[PDB]
């Protein structure tokens, strides 16, 4: 009969049942959204947003709620850190319950369409057979897509009749949902300009709307109709899978590299902020202009916010996790409690050494303390015998500036080594490893997991697009080849391949 991998092909030529299965899939996806939101809310810890934000807790789907308006909870807390006094219905809980209710309603609609499948809407008046006028259905759907895109751009994102979207500063320290005016011009095409989102969703939507008016009105040319097999729904499936993996690759790129639509405080920093020293340079210039203002190292480093110092830490890097190191980022190094300050390394004389930072590539990196110019001065040797650059020989002391360990000058070699090991990983922090029983191996942020999943899905959907394009373009030879193939495939039988009017 119908093998296990063809079982969903019975609904290929039954439009009502096709709507039913689409409804069931939509119901399942909405139910997943609601259930994931509920589970995340059950396991979320909203107490500390600066050292235990959403992305440190493995919050995958909540940032997408917080990205475009839903920053509050019925429990009287906000992802931004403020305490909500009178939360509205559209909180995290309300969104979750709405998605569950929509899942139930879509399930009921799927049941109705599965039972009542033989509607005159799906039957061709000319022939009476079940059929779908796909070019016009596409125009209707493109009208709907354009209207929704324009509405989102003009009302939701601009906040004319909506919350706006998440906007943040350069360093993720002061971010909130707010309206964004549309950025018409070249600046709208900056991926890190949130305003360019609005300018897009308006303008693109308008064009989409206009495109809908074309596709409802204008019938396809016969040439493209026969070439693309527009009367075959599997053409639509192939092209849709094509566009879908295209979008998946684009979203994967904007996730990994970052953009205005992937704020760091919602998904964690990127690997490239760590690679280029994006936050280290900002902290350095902050303390430098503080020093130029007459402040000292203690005061200058005390003015650095804990959030900014937390970003300057390799454990927050998405390129440090593992494929099977599962769970929240707090399950690895731990839950960050406090910042111990900048460990200046004053050598025996007083020169400032600096521990070379771990690159993301290396699981384990040697602890070497390079000089200002960078000749190696001291390090933690592997072979102690005949050691030249041991911290014992050179002599080093760790003076802490800022943080809870401020103003403390350790000058023993052991305690210097212990904080050299910490300074190898960027800024040094205190961690709670007991609440979640953390095992001391780094995990990936939601940024990395999104990138992984959608990269793999994009490749697999490229395979699917190949398969279904092949099927729709080779429908006539699905069951096998006939005897006609033997005459045309002969070399030189016809001047033009395939065509038999030639010779």
């Amino acid at each position: 009969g119908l093998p296990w991998y063809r079982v969903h092909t019975v609904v290929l030529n039954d439009p009502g049942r096709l709507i039913a299965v689409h409804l069931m899939h939509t119901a399942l996806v909405a139910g997943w959204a609601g259930s994931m939101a509920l589970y995340e809310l059950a396991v979320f810890d909203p107490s500390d947003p600066v050292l235990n934000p959403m992305w440190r807790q493995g919050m995958f789907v909540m940032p997408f709620m917080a990205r475009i308006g839903v920053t509050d909870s019925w429990g009287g807390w906000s992802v931004t850190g403020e305490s909500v006094a009178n939360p509205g219905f559209w909180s995290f809980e309300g969104v979750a319950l709405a998605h569950i209710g929509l899942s139930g309603l879509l399930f009921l609609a799927a049941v109705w369409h599965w039972v009542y499948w033989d509607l005159e809407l799906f039957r061709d008046p000319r022939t009476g057979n079940p059929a779908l006028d796909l070019p016009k259905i596409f125009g209707i759907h493109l009208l709907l897509s354009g209207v929704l895109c324009f509405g989102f751009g003009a009302f939701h994102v601009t906040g004319a009749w909506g919350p706006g979207i998440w906007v943040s500063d350069a360093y993720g320290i002061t971010g909130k949902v707010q309206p964004v005016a549309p950025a018409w011009g070249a600046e709208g095409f900056n991926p890190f300009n949130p305003s360019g989102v609005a300018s897009h969703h308006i303008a693109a939507g308008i064009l989409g709307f206009l495109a809908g008016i074309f596709h409802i009105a204008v019938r396809p040319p016969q040439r493209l109709y026969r070439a693309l097999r527009m009367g075959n729904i599997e053409t639509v499936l192939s092209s849709s899978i094509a566009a879908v993996f295209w979008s998946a690759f684009i979203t994967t790129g904007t996730m990994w590299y970052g953009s205005a639509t992937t704020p760091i405080e919602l998904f964690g920093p990127t690997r490239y902020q760590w690679d280029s020293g994006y936050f280290q340079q900002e902290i350095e210039r902050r303390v430098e202009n503080s020093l130029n203002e007459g402040l000292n190292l203690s005061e200058a480093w005390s003015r650095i916010p804990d959030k900014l110092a937390f970003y300057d830490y390799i454990g927050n890097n998405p390129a440090k996790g593992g494929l099977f190191r599962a769970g929240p980022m707090n399950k690895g190094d731990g839950i960050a409690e406090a910042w111990l300050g900048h460990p200046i390394f004053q050598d025996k004389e007083g020169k400032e050494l600096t521990v070379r930072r771990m690159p993301a590539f290396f699981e384990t990196f040697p602890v070497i303390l390079v000089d200002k110019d960078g000749i190696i001065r001291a390090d933690i040797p592997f072979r102690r015998a005949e050691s030249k650059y041991s911290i014992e020989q050179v002599g080093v002391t760790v003076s802490f500036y800022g943080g809870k360990l401020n103003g403390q000058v350790f000058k023993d070699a052991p305690t210097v080594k212990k904080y050299a090991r910490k300074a190898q990983l960027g800024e040094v922090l205190e961690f709670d490893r007991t609440t979640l029983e953390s095992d001391g191996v780094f995990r990936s942020s939601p940024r990395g997991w999104y990138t992984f999943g959608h990269a793999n899905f994009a490749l697999l959907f490229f395979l699917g697009h190949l398969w279904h394009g092949s099927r729709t373009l080779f429908r006539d030879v699905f069951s096998g080849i006939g005897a006609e193939v033997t005459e045309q495939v002969e070399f030189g039988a016809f001047q033009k391949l395939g065509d038999r009017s030639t010779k």
Partner: protein, 37 residues
């Protein structure tokens, strides 16, 4: 060995569910073959 605990459920159910699916697909088909005769 400090191993995970939901990994037991993951392995056992990810083995069980496809296995029972295959067994059901085989038994259904055979039943139908017997019923035809």
């Amino acid at each position: 060995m400090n191993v995970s605990v939901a990994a037991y459920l993951a392995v056992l159910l990810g083995t069980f569910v496809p296995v029972v699916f295959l067994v059901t697909l085989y038994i259904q088909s055979e039943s139908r073959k017997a019923g035809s005769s």
